[PDB]
Amino acid sequence: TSELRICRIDKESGPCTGGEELYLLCDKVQKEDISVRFSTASWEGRGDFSQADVHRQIAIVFKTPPYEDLEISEPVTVNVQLQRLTDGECSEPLPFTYLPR
C-alpha cells in the first residue's frame, strides 16, 4: 500500500560477492521507514544505505536527436546539458557519444 513502487535499478546484474554500489528509482518513500530487500524463496538480504542516500530527484525521459552526420565512421562524443528556455542558462555538460550505423 501507500504504493511502494520501484521504477528501475541502474544495474540488472553484478558479482555474487555483493558490496556493489547501485541505485534505484522509485516513487515517494519515507527515508526513515524504508529498506531494500534482495531475496529468493529461501534467502533474504538487505541493501546497504542510509537516509543520506535517499535523494529527491527529477527524471526526464526523452529521445535523442539525430546527429548532424549520419555517416560518421568513428564515435563522436558530444555534450548534453540542461538548458532553461527563458534565460537560456545551461548546466555543466555530461558526455554522450554517438555511434556510427
Next chain:
Amino acid sequence: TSELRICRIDKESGPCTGGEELYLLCDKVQKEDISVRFSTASWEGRGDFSQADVHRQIAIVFKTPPYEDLEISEPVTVNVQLQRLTDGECSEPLPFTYLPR
C-alpha cells in the same frame, strides 16, 4: 544559476541516427522552462520530450548484499524490492541477477 545540474544519463552512447529513448537524473527544474541540449562547438540538437516526461522521483544509492552462495557457477536472478520497516510492506519485485566470481 538556480543550479541546473545533471546527475547522470542512463546511456552514455547510442546510434547517430538518434530517436533513442533515454532518461537523465537532475536536480530541481521547471518542466515548463527546461530543455535538453546536445552539442559540439559547431552543432546543436535537442532531446525530444514533453512536460509529462519530467518525473519527480526518489533515487536510493546502496551497496548490494553478498549472495548466500559465493560459489555459484551459474547466474542467480533474485528479487529486489522496497520494504517498509514499520509494517514490513513490500513493493512489487524487480529482478537482479548475481554472477559467479
